């Protein structure tokens, strides 16, 4: 399509020439929150529908956490064509995050590196903002357009588990699913919450707070993990996830690795790397986690998705849903309908009646 072509060849290069990546992101969140976008050409077919996590998803393509950190553009994101929206990460108290510059474009790699550091308006602000549209969301969700909320922890916090428990209490009642983000590379000590004993203690507390919410306000709880785990780490996560009945996994966050071959001048900036160089590392983490949980723990696959093929590879590896974030940054809004359209064509070509039939198909070969 000409829209996709116009953005890819003209508008996006012009926008990257004019604005640093943080400004462009802020501007994009502002435009999107105002609805200043086309509106979806692409009409979702029934093949794209997925039922998982106690919900219907009209399509399996979501916006990853980090784009709409503070819950300001949710409605414009559904308008862009995403089948579900995840906001956050949200910390209990407001905090500024790291000094700028803290986001970097690696155009030659179709990659970004970021070290935002959980810049967040905080739970109260985000709570009031979601409350103002709570019933509009309840109808969106009933219509197949769910909302997730991704929870983080304050930089100076002296008890991580209590930060996450507060998140559960405050935003849990407004969310279809929560994410316990234990995988940011930009918060000191955070990723060590993924180890066995810490993780079990942490998630036991999270699930207990979730279980004490009223039934209609009780979300699914997912754990978002890194692409950089050891085999031991992964085995331990899978075991805990099964022992506690965690509802799902988000696989993966950004990488602290720098794969060989990066060309961008900014490749040695500190931060998490996203985009194309993360793609297969993420797909393989998905593959492993699905096998370790015997295909019984729903997985939302994320990292380097910019095409229908990218998405279908994660689905066949075991993802029930996918997300993207960095591709939007390079190709703009038209990438959303593009991924959905190609995914549907590939599903037909490969003989799948729908997305659901493809889920984990590589493990049954």
Ligand X SMILES: Cc1cc2nc3c(=O)[nH]c(=O)nc-3n(C[C@H](O)[C@H](O)[C@H](O)COP(=O)(O)O)c2cc1C
Ligand Y SMILES: O=C1N=C(Nc2ccc(F)cc2C(=O)O)S/C1=C\c1cccc2ccccc12
Ligand Z SMILES: O=C(O)c1cc(=O)[nH]c(=O)[nH]1
**Residues engaged in binding ligand X (CB under 6 A):** 64-66, 69, 88-89, 103, 112, 114, 116, 150, 181, 224, 253-254, 274-275, 278, 302-305, 324-327
CA neighbor of 37 nearest in space, from 352, 334, 344, 348: 334
Residues 50-69 that bind ligand Y (CB under 6 A): 67
- CB neighbour list of residue 135: distance below 8 Å, 6 or more residues apart: none
Q: Residue 184 catalytic?
A: yes
Asked if 329 is part of the footprint of ligand Z (rule: CB under 6 A), the reply reads no
Strands 220-225 and 248-251: what pairing?
parallel
The listed partner (ligand X, ligand Z, ligand Y, none) that binds 186, CB under 5 to 8 Å by sort, is ligand Z
Q: Is 325 annotated as a binding residue?
A: yes
* Angstrom distance (rounded) from CA 138 to CA 174: 9
Backbone phi, then psi, for 126, in 5-degree steps? -70, -35
Judged by beta carbon, residue 98 or residue 274, the one nearer ligand X is: 274
Interaction mask 115-144, ligand Z, x per CB under 6 A: xxxx--------------------------
Least separation in angstroms between residue 146's CB and ligand Y is: 20
Among 137, 186, 326, 329, binds ligand Z (CB under 6 A): 186
**32 is a contact residue toward ligand Y (CB under 6 A):** yes
- Can you tell me the distance from the alpha carbon of 95 to that of 254, in angstroms, rounded to the nearest whole number? 21
332 binds ligand Y (CB under 6 A): yes
**Of residues 237-266, those binding ligand Z (CB under 6 A):** 253-254
Question: How many beta carbons lie within 10 A of that of residue 359, not counting itself?
Answer: 24
Mark 104-127 as b/e (b = at least 16 C-beta within 10 Å).
bbbeebbbbbbbbbbbbbbbeebb
- Where does residue 62 fall: left (phi above 0), alpha (psi -120 to 50 degrees), or beta otherwise? beta
Query: Given 157, 184, 274, 282, which residue is catalytic?
Result: 184
Q: How far apart are CA 326 and CA 306, in angstroms?
A: 8
112, 175, 292, 324: residue in contact with ligand Y (rule CB under 6 A): 112
Q: Nearest approach, Cβ of 262 to ligand Z (angstroms)?
A: 16
Q: Which of the residues are catalytic?
A: 184
């Amino acid at each position: 399509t000409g829209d996709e072509r116009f953005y890819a060849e003209h508008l996006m290069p012009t926008l990257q020439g004019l604005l640093d990546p943080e400004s462009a992101h802020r501007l994009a969140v502002r435009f999107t929150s105002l609805g200043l976008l086309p509106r979806a050409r692409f009409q979702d077919s029934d093949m794209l529908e997925v039922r998982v996590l106690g919900h219907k998803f009209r399509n399996p393509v979501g916006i990853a956490a980090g784009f709409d950190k503070h819950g300001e553009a949710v409605d414009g994101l559904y308008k862009m064509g995403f089948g579900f929206v995840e906001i956050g990460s949200v910390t209990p108290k407001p905090q500024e995050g790291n000094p700028r510059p803290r986001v970097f474009r690696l155009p030659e790699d179709q990659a970004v590196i970021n070290r935002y550091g959980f810049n967040s308006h905080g739970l109260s602000v985000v709570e009031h903002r979601l409350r103002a549209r709570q019933q509009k969301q309840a109808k969106l969700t009933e219509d197949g357009l769910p909302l997730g909320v991704n929870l983080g922890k304050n930089k100076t916090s002296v008890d991580a588990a209590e930060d996450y428990a507060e998140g559960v209490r405050v935003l849990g009642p407004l969310a279809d699913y929560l994410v316990v983000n234990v995988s940011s590379p930009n918060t000191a000590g955070l990723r060590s919450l993924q180890g066995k004993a810490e993780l079990r203690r942490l998630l036991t507390k999270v699930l207990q707070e979730r279980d004490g919410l009223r039934r209609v306000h009780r979300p699914a709880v997912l754990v978002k993990i890194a692409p950089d785990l050891t085999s031991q780490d992964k085995e331990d996560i899978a075991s805990v996830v099964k022992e506690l009945g965690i509802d799902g996994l988000i696989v993966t966050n950004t990488t602290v690795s720098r794969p060989a071959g990066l060309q961008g001048a900014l490749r040695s900036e500190t931060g998490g790397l996203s985009g194309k160089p993360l793609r297969d590392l993420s797909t393989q983490t998905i593959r492993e986690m699905y096998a370790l949980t015997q295909g019984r723990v729903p997985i939302i696959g994320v990292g380097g998705v910019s095409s229908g093929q990218d998405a279908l590879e994660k689905i066949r590896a075991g993802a029930s849903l996918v997300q993207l974030y960095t591709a939007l940054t390079f190709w703009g809004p038209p990438v959303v309908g593009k991924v959905k359209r190609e995914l549907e064509a590939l599903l037909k070509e490969q003989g799948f009646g729908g997305v659901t039939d493809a889920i984990g198909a590589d493990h049954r070969r």
